[PDB]
Amino acid sequence: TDIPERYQELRAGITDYGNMSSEDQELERNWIAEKISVDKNFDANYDLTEFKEAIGNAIKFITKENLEVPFIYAYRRNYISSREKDGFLLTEDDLWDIVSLDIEFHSLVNKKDYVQRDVVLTAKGKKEIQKGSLYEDNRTPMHFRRDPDVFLKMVEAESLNLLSVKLHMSSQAKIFQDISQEVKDNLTKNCQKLVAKTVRHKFMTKLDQAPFIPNVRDPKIPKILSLTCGQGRFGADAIIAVYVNRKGDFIRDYKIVDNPFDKTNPEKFEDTLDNIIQSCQPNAIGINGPNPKTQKFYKRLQEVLHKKQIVDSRGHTIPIIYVEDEVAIRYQNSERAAQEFPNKPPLVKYCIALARYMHSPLLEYANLTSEEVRSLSIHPHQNLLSSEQLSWALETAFVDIVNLVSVEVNKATDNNYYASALKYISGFGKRKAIDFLQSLQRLNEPLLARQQLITHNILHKTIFMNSAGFLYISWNEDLEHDQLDSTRIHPEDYHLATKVAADALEYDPDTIAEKEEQGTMSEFIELLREDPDRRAKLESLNLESYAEELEKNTGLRKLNNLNTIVLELLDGFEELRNDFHPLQGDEIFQSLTGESEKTFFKGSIIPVRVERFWHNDIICTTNSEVECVVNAQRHAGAQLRRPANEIYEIGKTYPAKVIYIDYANITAEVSLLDHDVKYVPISYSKDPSIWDLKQELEDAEEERKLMMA
C-alpha cells in the first residue's frame, strides 16, 4: 500500500512484475538505454558506459526504490547525469519514457517467457473530401518520423470507413497481411506516442506561468478589479465590473450603466469609473470580451485612465492587460461556480474567473474536471489520441508543474480551491489526497514540523520520502519552529544544510563536534539568520569543493542538492515559474474574433458584408464582425475622382480580397474588383511519385459530369 498511487494504477494489471532475474535486468537496462540513445543521437560509442550506467541508476530508483520521476529529478538529479558538464541530462520526458518503456518491457518479457510456460478510397470516397479541405494531403515509415499525424489522419479516415491503406509492398515480384498488420499497429502506437509528447509539452507551456505582478520593482500581491465589455452593445448592456482582494476572495460586484461612448456626456462614465477606482483602489485591471468591441472598450479605458491620471503610490499608471478567458468561458457554465455563488449573473462569474486566472493559472487549470479539461482546446489534433494517452499526457503535465512550486499544507487544509491541486503532488493521487485531507482535518491543529507527518503516522516512509520535500510550512513568529520547514529542502539533507551553513559561518572545528554531541545544529542556521553579512559570507563558499569532499568521504553524490541548499538559504521559496503571458497581437485578434488563420489570413478570398459607406472609402463586415478599409483606388473609383456610391449598393453580399490585416488594431484592407477577387490558396505536394497525377486527372471527368449525372 506504501506505493505511489500512479504506480499502483499502472502496475495494477501486470503479474509477477517484481520477479526479474540478473540476465533479465541487464537485458532491460541495455535495451532501454538503446531506446533512449536513439533519441539522444550520440556519435560513435561516446563512452556509452556512463550513459547506460545512468539508465541503470534511473531504473533502480523507479523499479526498486519506487521513487516518482519528479522526486528523482529534483533530489537525485546528479545520479542521473554525467559527472562532467554538458555531458548528458535525462529530462522529465526521458524519465517518463523510461517508466513507460519499463512497464511494457516487463509485460513483453512476461509474454515471450510465457511461451515456455498509397490511399484506396471506398464507395463513400470523393464525398467527404470535396477537393477543398485539409485532407487534400509511396508513403513510407521514414516519412512518418517527421509528420506522424498524417498517419493518424489516414487511420481516422479508415475508422469512419472512407479510405483504406494497404501496406506498401509493390516490390513484391493472407500471409503478407498476417505479417504486416503487426507493423501497422506498431506504427499507430509509435505515432500516437509521438503526438502525445507534443500535446503534453504545449499544455506544459500553458501551465508554466507565474502570477502577474503589477510592479516589477517592488512586486506584491495585487488588488485586482476585473471588468468585461459584455456583448458589445454600448449605450446598453451595462458594463460589469468585479473586485477581488489580495487574498483572492470576492468582495463586491458592480454594474456601470453609463455609456463610455455617449459623446453627449462622456464625463458621466468617467466620473462613475473614477469613483469605482477610488472605492476599490486596485492595482491592475483585467479585460476580455466576446467580440471586437472589446478593442474599442479597452482603448477607451486606457485613454480614460490616462485622463484621470490614475496612478498607484509608485506614481506609474495602473496597467490594463488582456487575459486569456478559455477557462473563464468554461467556468461560467461550471456547476462548481453555480454552487459557489448563489445569485450572480454569468458576466460576474466570468469576471471573477478572469481575476482568479490573473492570480494563479495553475490552480484554475487544476480545478477543471476531467471532461472539461479533456474537451479543452489544447492541440489542433488532440482528438486523434485516445482517452488514455491524452489523460496520461495531462496527468504528467500537471505532476511536473505542481511539483515545481510547492504546496502549502496549512492553506490546503481549508482552502478547498487551493487544496484541489494536492492530488497531483508527487506520491499522491485521488485516493490518497482525500485521506490526507481528512487526517489533517482530524488533527484540528496546524502542522508545526514535517516530522509530525510521520510521528502521527499520517504518511508512510516511502510516500513521505516521495512527497515530504514538496510540502512546506510557512514561517511566522516556539522551539518546535524550524526555519528549514519554510524551504523546499528534503528532511534527509537537513543535517547537510546545517553542516554547509556551519562551514559558511566558519565555526571552530571543535565546536561542530561539541554542538553535535549537544544536539544543537539548529543554532547554526539561527545564527546565520541573525548575522547581517549573509551575502558576502554565503556566496564565497565553493560548492564544487564541498561536494567533492562529501562524495569522497561519505560516498554520496549531492552536488545539485547542495546547490539548491545554498540557493534557498538566501531567501525562502524563490519563484521559479516564468513571467506572465499577456495576450499580445495575433493571439489577441484570434481570441477576440474566433476566425482561424485557415479562413482569415493575408491574401484570403472571403465573402464580406457591406454595412456602412464613407466619404470616399467603403466599409466591410465579416462573419464575426470584422471591419475592413477599402480605398477608392481598389474598386476603380478614385482613378477619376467622384464618390463611390455610383457603383455599389447596400445589403447585397459581395466577394472580396483581403490585402492587409492588423491583428493588433483589428482592421483590414480589402479589394473588391474582379481583377483581384476572381487562385490556389492551399496545395500540398504534387511530385508524380509522391502525388497521384493519374487519379487527379482521371477524376476530373467524373467531377465535371456529376452536375449532369
XYZ file of C-alpha atoms in Angstrom:
709
model
C 0.000 0.000 0.000
C 3.007 2.267 0.595
C 3.353 2.675 -3.173
C 2.789 5.847 -5.237
C -0.801 5.887 -6.456
C 0.158 6.380 -10.108
C 2.485 3.373 -9.966
C -0.199 1.302 -8.229
C -2.595 2.142 -11.061
C -0.071 1.377 -13.792
C 1.084 -1.901 -12.207
C -2.477 -2.934 -11.308
C -2.849 -5.369 -14.214
C 0.583 -6.965 -14.615
C 1.553 -10.028 -12.564
C 4.902 -11.036 -11.037
C 6.200 -7.626 -12.125
C 8.880 -7.685 -9.416
C 10.205 -11.151 -10.336
C 13.153 -10.293 -12.604
C 16.485 -12.113 -12.854
C 20.002 -10.730 -13.275
C 20.092 -11.509 -17.001
C 16.620 -10.007 -17.403
C 17.745 -6.861 -15.571
C 20.855 -6.462 -17.737
C 18.749 -7.056 -20.857
C 16.256 -4.432 -19.674
C 18.977 -1.877 -18.938
C 20.937 -2.354 -22.173
C 17.824 -2.351 -24.366
C 16.075 0.617 -22.765
C 19.342 2.553 -22.816
C 19.487 1.855 -26.553
C 15.898 3.087 -26.941
C 16.679 6.432 -25.326
C 20.035 6.601 -27.114
C 18.093 6.602 -30.380
C 16.558 9.946 -29.414
C 19.762 11.293 -27.853
C 21.632 10.912 -31.178
C 25.087 10.014 -29.890
C 28.160 9.652 -32.106
C 30.283 6.501 -32.142
C 30.400 4.921 -28.679
C 30.816 8.200 -26.749
C 31.817 6.084 -23.734
C 28.256 4.745 -23.577
C 29.198 3.039 -20.288
C 28.370 6.203 -18.333
C 25.058 6.620 -20.171
C 23.957 3.020 -19.632
C 25.048 3.449 -16.005
C 22.778 6.474 -15.649
C 19.890 4.401 -17.018
C 20.833 1.663 -14.563
C 20.528 4.101 -11.668
C 17.273 5.525 -13.040
C 15.633 2.122 -13.429
C 16.894 1.121 -9.982
C 15.214 4.180 -8.460
C 11.971 3.525 -10.365
C 11.656 -0.264 -10.057
C 13.344 -0.958 -6.707
C 13.072 2.183 -4.560
C 9.665 3.206 -6.008
C 10.548 6.882 -6.478
C 8.446 9.112 -8.707
C 10.199 10.886 -11.576
C 9.780 14.422 -10.137
C 11.468 13.383 -6.894
C 14.330 11.740 -8.790
C 14.862 14.805 -10.985
C 14.657 17.172 -8.004
C 16.733 15.440 -5.307
C 18.522 12.643 -7.225
C 19.468 14.558 -10.387
C 23.236 14.154 -10.065
C 22.938 10.356 -10.122
C 21.140 10.724 -13.483
C 23.744 12.850 -15.251
C 27.352 12.861 -16.369
C 29.740 13.976 -13.652
C 31.203 16.419 -16.178
C 29.317 19.409 -17.566
C 27.299 19.296 -20.817
C 27.720 15.518 -20.985
C 24.167 14.154 -20.762
C 20.981 15.010 -18.867
C 17.856 12.830 -18.855
C 14.919 15.273 -18.928
C 11.471 14.691 -17.436
C 10.425 13.411 -20.846
C 13.189 10.810 -20.763
C 12.201 9.655 -17.264
C 8.519 9.401 -18.221
C 9.602 7.435 -21.280
C 11.734 5.182 -19.084
C 8.812 4.318 -16.792
C 6.509 3.757 -19.776
C 9.069 1.548 -21.511
C 9.783 -0.282 -18.244
C 6.205 -1.436 -17.693
C 5.878 -2.558 -21.319
C 9.276 -4.289 -21.133
C 8.232 -6.347 -18.125
C 4.928 -7.167 -19.828
C 6.643 -8.068 -23.125
C 9.172 -10.367 -21.471
C 6.305 -11.899 -19.485
C 4.778 -12.830 -22.842
C 7.957 -14.026 -24.535
C 8.711 -16.192 -21.492
C 5.103 -17.414 -21.166
C 5.767 -19.440 -24.337
C 7.943 -21.691 -22.186
C 5.158 -21.579 -19.580
C -0.969 4.794 -51.018
C -4.621 5.641 -50.319
C -7.503 3.498 -51.618
C -10.890 5.222 -51.433
C -14.180 3.371 -50.910
C -17.665 3.790 -52.371
C -18.059 6.633 -49.849
C -14.982 8.151 -51.492
C -14.893 11.543 -53.206
C -17.733 12.636 -50.900
C -16.080 13.606 -47.586
C -13.039 15.332 -49.140
C -14.752 17.511 -51.790
C -11.271 18.545 -53.015
C -11.354 21.573 -50.704
C -10.387 20.597 -47.151
C -7.200 19.974 -45.159
C -7.488 16.302 -46.195
C -6.235 17.187 -49.692
C -2.816 15.948 -48.468
C 4.517 5.973 -51.739
C 4.279 6.868 -48.046
C 6.972 5.130 -46.005
C 7.954 4.777 -42.325
C 10.846 7.210 -42.735
C 8.410 9.991 -43.724
C 6.214 9.385 -40.640
C 9.097 10.176 -38.269
C 8.532 13.857 -39.224
C 4.761 14.202 -39.881
C 3.361 11.471 -37.596
C -0.128 12.995 -37.509
C -0.569 12.315 -41.242
C -0.797 8.605 -40.437
C -3.388 9.373 -37.771
C -5.359 11.240 -40.436
C -5.396 8.159 -42.661
C -6.211 5.851 -39.733
C -9.131 8.081 -38.734
C -10.381 8.147 -42.328
C -10.250 4.343 -42.199
C -12.130 4.292 -38.881
C -15.036 6.201 -40.443
C -14.795 3.848 -43.478
C -13.759 6.403 -46.111
C -10.394 5.093 -47.351
C -8.290 2.036 -46.535
C -4.493 1.753 -46.620
C -2.804 -1.417 -47.888
C 0.790 -1.698 -46.705
C 3.471 -0.638 -49.197
C 4.595 -3.823 -50.933
C 4.969 -3.046 -54.653
C 8.421 -4.652 -54.512
C 6.503 -7.949 -54.479
C 7.567 -9.914 -57.541
C -3.399 -13.591 -46.056
C 0.271 -14.290 -45.357
C 1.513 -10.795 -46.180
C -1.333 -9.232 -44.204
C -0.785 -11.630 -41.309
C 2.783 -10.361 -41.076
C 2.155 -6.648 -41.917
C -0.774 -5.528 -39.717
C 1.649 -6.156 -36.829
C 3.836 -3.388 -38.261
C 0.702 -1.297 -38.828
C -0.212 -1.500 -35.133
C 3.381 -0.761 -34.130
C 3.265 2.345 -36.327
C -0.032 3.502 -34.841
C 1.335 3.103 -31.305
C 4.587 4.915 -32.126
C 2.925 7.859 -33.871
C 0.297 8.147 -31.122
C 3.079 8.396 -28.532
C 4.945 10.968 -30.610
C 1.900 13.239 -30.842
C 1.208 12.681 -27.133
C 4.618 14.217 -26.469
C 3.875 17.473 -28.294
C 0.401 17.842 -26.775
C 1.897 17.325 -23.305
C 4.653 19.870 -23.934
C 2.253 22.519 -25.183
C -0.004 22.064 -22.163
C 3.152 22.384 -20.060
C 3.988 25.788 -21.513
C 0.451 26.926 -20.645
C 0.924 25.766 -17.048
C 4.340 27.433 -16.651
C 3.005 30.945 -15.923
C 3.830 32.750 -12.677
C 1.337 35.129 -11.032
C 1.011 38.520 -12.682
C 2.989 41.306 -10.999
C 1.787 44.943 -11.138
C 5.150 46.389 -10.083
C 8.375 44.794 -11.309
C 10.398 46.982 -8.932
C 8.513 46.055 -5.730
C 6.199 43.139 -6.580
C 3.478 42.430 -4.014
C 0.139 40.656 -4.248
C -2.089 42.856 -6.473
C -5.543 44.245 -5.763
C -7.467 43.277 -8.899
C -10.556 44.936 -10.403
C -11.980 42.852 -13.244
C -14.446 44.214 -15.795
C -15.863 42.904 -19.075
C -17.178 44.747 -22.123
C -20.212 42.472 -22.361
C -21.951 41.510 -25.573
C -20.512 44.710 -27.093
C -23.729 46.743 -27.435
C -22.795 50.081 -25.892
C -25.372 52.530 -24.603
C -26.960 49.422 -23.049
C -25.740 46.092 -21.659
C -24.260 47.852 -18.648
C -20.536 47.237 -18.219
C -19.909 44.686 -15.462
C -17.035 45.124 -13.009
C -15.891 42.967 -10.088
C -13.437 43.497 -7.229
C -11.301 40.843 -5.534
C -8.873 41.363 -2.666
C -5.274 40.189 -2.406
C -6.493 37.117 -0.502
C -8.410 36.094 -3.634
C -11.876 36.434 -2.085
C -14.677 38.182 -3.948
C -15.599 41.447 -2.223
C -18.184 43.259 -4.339
C -19.561 43.323 -7.884
C -20.548 46.437 -9.832
C -22.509 47.393 -12.946
C -21.877 50.622 -14.873
C -24.874 51.673 -16.966
C -23.297 54.956 -18.107
C -22.072 54.628 -21.683
C -18.340 55.322 -22.225
C -19.172 56.376 -25.802
C -22.055 58.762 -25.123
C -20.426 61.751 -26.830
C -23.165 63.919 -25.303
C -21.871 63.468 -21.725
C -18.709 61.322 -21.655
C -17.940 62.852 -18.235
C -20.663 60.592 -16.796
C -18.853 57.293 -17.393
C -15.500 58.843 -16.461
C -16.922 60.023 -13.129
C -18.532 56.733 -12.130
C -15.475 54.707 -13.146
C -13.305 57.149 -11.188
C -15.496 56.532 -8.141
C -15.131 52.781 -8.709
C -11.343 53.114 -8.646
C -11.439 55.471 -5.652
C -13.508 52.906 -3.748
C -11.632 49.722 -4.656
C -8.202 51.333 -5.236
C -6.995 48.351 -7.314
C -3.506 47.817 -8.709
C -4.385 46.220 -12.073
C -7.313 45.909 -14.493
C -8.203 42.780 -16.479
C -10.274 42.669 -19.668
C -11.548 40.122 -22.198
C -14.686 40.118 -24.316
C -16.668 38.013 -26.783
C -16.242 40.303 -29.819
C -14.013 43.044 -31.334
C -15.996 45.719 -29.481
C -13.627 44.842 -26.627
C -10.794 46.542 -28.523
C -12.650 49.859 -28.627
C -13.642 49.384 -24.983
C -10.007 48.783 -23.985
C -8.826 51.832 -25.924
C -11.459 53.909 -24.131
C -10.395 52.529 -20.744
C -6.750 53.338 -21.482
C -7.460 56.913 -22.562
C -9.856 57.437 -19.634
C -7.273 56.164 -17.149
C -4.643 58.449 -18.666
C -7.109 61.350 -18.495
C -7.890 60.875 -14.799
C -4.169 60.388 -14.002
C -4.953 57.197 -12.070
C -1.637 56.015 -10.612
C -0.580 53.841 -7.694
C 1.602 55.134 -4.869
C 4.545 54.261 -7.131
C 3.371 57.069 -9.427
C 3.028 54.876 -12.520
C -0.295 54.281 -14.247
C -2.354 51.232 -13.304
C -1.705 48.616 -16.019
C -4.513 47.197 -18.145
C -3.922 43.719 -19.564
C -5.732 41.304 -21.858
C -6.067 37.953 -20.071
C -6.883 34.552 -21.544
C -10.505 33.540 -20.900
C -10.889 29.930 -22.104
C -11.076 28.637 -18.538
C -13.398 31.537 -17.729
C -15.701 30.525 -20.589
C -15.862 27.026 -19.131
C -16.199 28.370 -15.572
C -19.337 30.390 -16.291
C -21.111 27.135 -17.223
C -19.390 25.101 -14.491
C -21.633 23.651 -11.784
C -18.960 24.430 -9.179
C -19.305 28.143 -9.948
C -23.099 27.987 -9.587
C -22.769 26.222 -6.226
C -20.086 28.728 -5.194
C -22.083 31.922 -5.773
C -25.882 31.852 -5.280
C -27.052 34.996 -7.120
C -24.560 36.195 -9.738
C -25.114 36.794 -13.468
C -22.865 34.922 -15.918
C -20.758 38.024 -16.600
C -19.979 38.368 -12.879
C -18.825 34.751 -12.626
C -16.794 35.204 -15.810
C -15.097 38.353 -14.480
C -14.257 36.509 -11.259
C -12.747 33.662 -13.270
C -10.664 36.217 -15.157
C -9.392 37.636 -11.871
C -8.528 34.205 -10.482
C -6.690 33.333 -13.693
C -4.736 36.551 -13.255
C -3.767 35.423 -9.745
C -2.920 31.731 -10.343
C -3.354 29.969 -13.710
C -2.092 26.720 -12.171
C -4.929 26.489 -9.654
C -7.508 27.434 -12.289
C -6.373 24.702 -14.687
C -6.098 22.179 -11.844
C -9.664 22.888 -10.706
C -11.105 21.790 -14.056
C -12.828 18.414 -14.046
C -11.995 15.542 -16.401
C -14.466 16.140 -19.266
C -13.992 19.937 -19.444
C -10.196 19.706 -19.415
C -10.387 16.845 -21.923
C -12.560 18.936 -24.264
C -10.303 21.947 -23.661
C -8.841 23.200 -26.941
C -5.193 22.330 -26.296
C -3.899 20.969 -29.612
C -5.350 21.041 -33.145
C -5.249 17.228 -33.424
C -5.779 16.298 -29.769
C -8.851 14.255 -30.758
C -6.685 11.691 -32.567
C -5.222 10.360 -29.310
C -7.454 8.055 -27.304
C -8.682 8.990 -23.830
C -5.970 7.015 -22.001
C -2.934 8.509 -23.760
C -4.326 12.047 -23.614
C -5.174 11.662 -19.926
C -1.687 10.346 -19.159
C -0.136 13.276 -21.041
C -2.229 15.687 -18.982
C -1.508 13.958 -15.676
C 2.242 14.057 -16.336
C 1.993 17.737 -17.262
C 0.153 18.572 -14.041
C 2.581 16.488 -11.959
C 5.622 18.343 -13.276
C 4.400 21.900 -12.730
C 2.590 21.156 -9.455
C 5.837 19.729 -8.085
C 7.880 22.634 -9.459
C 6.160 25.006 -6.990
C 5.445 23.631 -3.517
C 2.016 23.373 -1.875
C 1.301 24.988 1.499
C -0.340 22.343 3.690
C -1.772 24.921 6.105
C -3.644 26.662 3.287
C -4.721 23.368 1.701
C -6.367 22.088 4.891
C -9.250 24.552 4.472
C -8.872 26.408 1.147
C -10.513 23.715 -0.968
C -9.891 25.783 -4.110
C -6.158 25.899 -3.337
C -6.080 22.332 -1.955
C -7.637 20.680 -5.029
C -4.183 20.612 -6.670
C -2.790 18.337 -3.932
C -3.851 15.147 -5.749
C -1.145 15.887 -8.348
C 1.714 16.256 -5.853
C 4.438 13.615 -6.076
C 3.414 10.404 -4.352
C -0.271 11.319 -4.193
C -3.471 10.652 -6.062
C -7.247 10.663 -5.959
C -7.498 8.084 -3.168
C -4.560 9.485 -1.178
C -5.485 13.187 -1.324
C -8.886 12.662 0.317
C -7.408 10.531 3.112
C -4.609 13.053 3.702
C -7.016 15.988 3.911
C -9.360 14.029 6.185
C -6.471 13.231 8.534
C -5.359 16.864 8.652
C -8.947 17.883 9.382
C -8.996 15.379 12.240
C -5.798 16.967 13.569
C -7.600 20.278 14.305
C -4.192 21.989 14.567
C -1.624 23.370 12.116
C 1.396 21.214 11.391
C 4.415 22.551 13.266
C 7.107 20.444 11.571
C 7.320 17.998 8.681
C 8.260 15.182 11.067
C 4.740 15.417 12.506
C 3.563 13.770 9.274
C 5.344 10.537 10.233
C 5.149 10.745 14.041
C 1.343 10.885 13.904
C 1.549 8.167 11.207
C -0.167 10.498 8.737
C 2.002 9.093 5.919
C 4.241 6.078 5.347
C 8.001 6.057 4.877
C 8.036 5.647 1.091
C 5.228 8.153 0.484
C 6.772 10.619 2.943
C 10.151 10.370 1.218
C 8.411 10.834 -2.134
C 6.460 13.934 -1.035
C 7.931 15.457 2.148
C 10.284 17.595 0.047
C 7.475 19.458 -1.727
C 5.075 20.039 1.171
C 6.081 23.052 3.254
C 5.014 25.111 6.264
C 5.165 28.898 6.132
C 7.371 30.680 8.667
C 5.974 33.170 11.181
C 6.657 34.497 14.683
C 8.320 28.133 19.780
C 11.260 25.729 19.884
C 9.256 23.409 17.618
C 9.507 26.005 14.841
C 12.294 25.463 12.304
C 13.482 27.733 9.500
C 14.089 24.765 7.188
C 10.353 23.996 7.328
C 9.825 27.125 5.182
C 12.164 25.843 2.456
C 11.883 23.082 -0.153
C 14.689 21.076 1.445
C 14.154 17.361 1.885
C 14.336 16.175 5.518
C 17.231 13.818 4.718
C 19.601 16.678 3.835
C 18.691 18.929 6.769
C 21.873 17.795 8.523
C 23.805 18.557 5.329
C 22.232 22.015 5.136
C 23.265 22.675 8.735
C 26.815 21.485 8.001
C 27.197 23.683 4.912
C 25.815 26.633 6.871
C 28.333 25.889 9.637
C 31.180 25.891 7.114
C 29.904 29.159 5.641
C 29.864 30.502 9.222
C 33.480 29.409 9.873
C 32.903 27.743 13.221
C 35.800 26.319 15.204
C 36.274 22.667 14.132
C 35.925 21.548 17.762
C 32.639 23.387 18.279
C 30.986 21.480 15.419
C 31.616 18.256 17.333
C 30.573 19.857 20.622
C 27.293 21.059 19.086
C 26.714 17.637 17.517
C 27.210 15.889 20.852
C 24.896 18.518 22.361
C 22.351 18.183 19.529
C 22.431 21.909 18.749
C 22.840 22.068 14.957
C 19.764 24.314 14.515
C 21.545 27.166 16.279
C 23.872 27.387 13.281
C 21.063 28.274 10.878
C 19.657 30.570 13.565
C 22.967 32.431 13.876
C 23.202 32.644 10.084
C 19.732 34.190 10.095
C 20.775 36.704 12.764
C 24.070 37.952 11.319
C 23.864 40.694 8.641
C 26.600 39.725 6.141
C 24.649 36.842 4.650
C 25.689 37.554 1.048
C 29.436 38.172 1.332
C 29.716 35.162 3.652
C 27.460 32.700 1.796
C 28.354 33.042 -1.902
C 32.079 32.940 -1.076
C 31.659 29.191 -0.462
C 32.671 26.993 -3.408
C 30.060 24.280 -3.970
C 32.342 22.008 -6.018
C 34.975 21.585 -3.292
C 32.390 20.746 -0.627
C 30.507 18.354 -2.914
C 33.768 16.589 -3.771
C 34.754 16.220 -0.114
C 31.263 14.890 0.637
C 31.326 12.290 -2.127
C 34.925 11.312 -1.345
C 34.232 10.647 2.345
C 30.550 9.674 2.568
C 30.310 8.319 -0.988
C 27.055 10.121 -1.796
C 26.628 12.425 -4.808
C 24.606 15.549 -3.966
C 26.089 18.494 -5.890
C 22.707 19.579 -7.275
C 21.106 19.189 -3.852
C 23.833 21.259 -2.183
C 23.310 23.886 -4.877
C 19.616 24.091 -4.038
C 20.579 24.297 -0.353
C 22.858 27.296 -0.794
C 20.475 28.925 -3.283
C 17.434 28.757 -0.996
C 19.464 29.616 2.112
C 19.290 33.232 0.891
C 15.515 33.607 0.522
C 12.829 31.006 1.085
C 10.815 29.732 -1.890
C 12.036 31.995 -4.663
C 9.568 31.867 -7.544
C 10.746 29.572 -10.344
C 7.893 29.825 -12.858
C 8.431 32.113 -15.833
C 6.818 35.525 -16.268
C 3.143 36.007 -17.077
C 1.924 35.738 -20.691
C -0.358 38.642 -21.662
C -2.200 38.286 -24.958
C -0.217 40.401 -27.453
C -1.141 40.859 -31.110
C -2.135 37.885 -33.205
C -3.358 35.920 -30.199
C -5.499 38.939 -29.269
C -7.212 39.008 -32.646
C -7.577 35.212 -32.660
C -9.143 35.113 -29.184
C -11.432 38.138 -29.609
C -12.537 37.243 -33.171
C -12.530 33.450 -33.400
C -11.589 33.457 -37.096
C -8.955 30.839 -37.887
C -5.821 31.523 -39.918
C -7.204 28.948 -42.379
C -10.049 31.355 -43.245
C -8.927 34.918 -42.414
C -5.272 35.304 -43.411
C -3.093 37.541 -45.582
C -4.459 37.395 -49.132
C -7.601 35.313 -48.487
C -10.706 35.444 -50.689
C -13.585 35.689 -48.208
C -17.187 36.925 -48.587
C -17.719 40.312 -46.956
C -20.888 42.112 -45.892
C -21.035 45.795 -46.863
C -22.656 47.680 -43.986
C -21.521 51.325 -43.945
C -20.320 53.821 -46.552
C -17.892 56.729 -46.212
C -16.880 59.978 -47.928
C -14.752 58.006 -50.416
C -13.810 54.716 -48.686
C -16.111 51.714 -48.249
C -16.695 49.596 -45.147
C -16.723 45.830 -44.606
C -18.262 43.292 -42.269
C -17.252 39.650 -41.883
C -18.843 36.546 -40.405
C -17.507 37.610 -36.975
C -17.938 41.410 -37.280
C -14.561 42.473 -38.683
C -14.241 45.910 -40.309
C -12.218 46.360 -43.497
C -10.989 49.630 -45.015
C -11.162 49.819 -48.817
C -9.746 52.899 -50.515
C -11.476 54.123 -53.671
C -8.406 53.092 -55.728
C -9.197 49.410 -55.024
C -12.653 49.426 -56.672
C -11.765 51.653 -59.676
C -13.494 54.615 -58.033
C -10.814 57.249 -57.346
C -8.949 56.908 -60.667
C -11.137 59.777 -61.945
C -12.382 61.121 -58.584
C -16.070 61.462 -57.530
C -17.886 59.435 -54.824
C -18.119 55.635 -54.912
C -21.896 55.428 -54.277
C -22.445 55.379 -58.053
C -21.057 51.808 -58.166
C -22.181 49.627 -55.231
C -25.429 49.205 -53.283
C -26.189 48.360 -49.653
C -27.422 44.939 -48.491
C -26.180 42.514 -51.131
C -23.391 40.003 -50.422
C -20.106 40.714 -52.214
C -16.937 38.591 -52.604
C -13.751 40.413 -51.632
C -9.990 40.003 -51.173
C -8.017 40.983 -48.060
C -4.699 42.748 -48.671
C -3.583 43.693 -45.148
C -4.609 42.528 -41.666
C -3.801 44.495 -38.490
C -4.264 41.842 -35.809
C -3.325 44.327 -33.075
C -5.753 47.046 -34.234
C -8.367 44.654 -35.698
C -8.546 46.354 -39.103
C -8.002 45.105 -42.646
C -7.548 46.458 -46.167
C -9.596 44.767 -48.903
C -10.018 44.875 -52.680
C -13.379 44.295 -54.351
C -12.510 44.269 -58.076
C -12.847 41.074 -60.089
C -9.233 41.734 -61.099
C -8.295 40.700 -57.542
C -11.406 38.815 -56.375
C -11.701 36.448 -59.370
C -6.250 31.258 -57.178
C -4.778 28.287 -55.304
C -4.548 29.351 -51.636
C -3.745 25.797 -50.466
C -2.000 22.959 -52.306
C 0.046 20.034 -50.984
C 2.887 18.150 -52.696
C 2.431 17.226 -56.357
C 5.504 15.194 -57.370
C 4.424 12.346 -59.713
C 5.577 9.669 -57.252
C 4.569 11.477 -54.062
C 1.223 12.550 -55.549
C -1.141 10.550 -57.768
C -1.406 12.526 -61.000
C -3.376 9.671 -62.589
C -6.212 9.888 -60.058
C -6.292 13.701 -60.182
C -6.539 13.783 -63.995
C -8.969 10.833 -64.275
C -11.321 12.186 -61.582
C -11.793 15.465 -63.498
C -14.255 13.791 -65.888
C -16.451 12.486 -63.069
C -16.221 15.812 -61.232
C -17.359 17.688 -64.353
C -20.175 15.244 -65.234
C -21.577 14.789 -61.702
C -23.564 18.016 -62.079
C -25.280 16.368 -65.075
C -25.040 12.822 -63.634
